[PDB]
């Protein structure tokens, strides 16, 4: 019998996993959700419609202790791939969207690691509201933004934070938009000067 089948029966049916309930020991705890954003392409900026269209990959990470297992008890399965409809999600949305598309476009699998970390990298096409400043046009620069928050959970139930990377065993927060230094095709009309992130 496939060890994945046994492990999934264990996690979801045997332990009775409820995706409706937050992964907390006590209701007063908030789940830390870490976000990073990878900009795949800057599709367009339309000044007449004041709309920024971007292709992005939103790297979610959080801990769900209900999804822990010992790999040696399940044939050294260290990572598991699940439909996002099965697990509890923090339900993050693009707040400043321009067209009513609040949620992510493609519901890809979540990766659940044996130590309980849930990693998700949904790709999405977003059309955000970017108010244009026309003063110096054409030599203008625009300060667009993407604002992510949860409407289903408040700041008491889940905590937003930036992803931390590490070098020389010293951690630091990733305070900027991730861009591929070689695969990123630049937009035909716009150059990215700065790309900070703030909580």
């Amino acid at each position: 019998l496939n060890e994945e089948e046994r492990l999934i029966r264990h996690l979801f049916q045997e332990k009775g996993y409820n995706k409706e309930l937050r992964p907390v020991a006590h209701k007063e705890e908030s789940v830390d959700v870490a976000l990073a954003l990878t900009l795949s392409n800057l599709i367009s900026l339309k000044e007449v419609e004041e709309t920024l269209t971007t292709n992005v990959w939103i790297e979610h990470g959080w801990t769900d202790n209900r999804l822990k297992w010992n790999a040696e008890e399940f044939g050294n399965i260290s990572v598991l791939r699940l439909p996002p409809d099965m697990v509890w999600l923090p339900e993050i949305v693009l707040e400043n969207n321009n067209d009513g598309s609040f949620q992510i476009s493609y519901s890809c699998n979540v990766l659940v690691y044996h130590y309980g970390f849930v990693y998700w990298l949904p790709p999405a096409i977003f059309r955000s509201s970017c108010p244009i400043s026309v003063t110096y046009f054409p030599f203008d620069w625009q300060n667009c933004s993407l604002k992510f928050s949860s409407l289903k959970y408040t700041a008491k139930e889940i905590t937003l934070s930036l992803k931390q990377d590490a070098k020389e065993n010293r951690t630091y927060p990733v305070e900027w938009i991730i861009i591929d230094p070689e695969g990123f095709t630049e937009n035909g009309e716009w150059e990215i000067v700065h790309r900070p992130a703030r909580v």
């Binding site: 990878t38 795949s40 990959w57 790297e59 990693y119 992803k163 990377d165 990733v174 591929d180 230094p181």
Partner: protein, 73 residues
Amino acid sequence: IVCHTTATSPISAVTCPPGENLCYRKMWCDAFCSSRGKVVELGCAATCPSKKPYEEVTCCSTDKCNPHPKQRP
């Protein structure tokens, strides 16, 4: 000389072609560098490969002197 190469899957140790004498390892970030770490390319070269601005290259003349970052010589 014998060097590591990524031309095979998995990484394998291969005797270089005649004339080529330097093992090399090249690395750079890609769209997945945030979670997968740097790309790693291992191989044999007669001359140390040119560096694109984002690339990191290390060249050496010892057998198996260019291990994967998780391995050791």
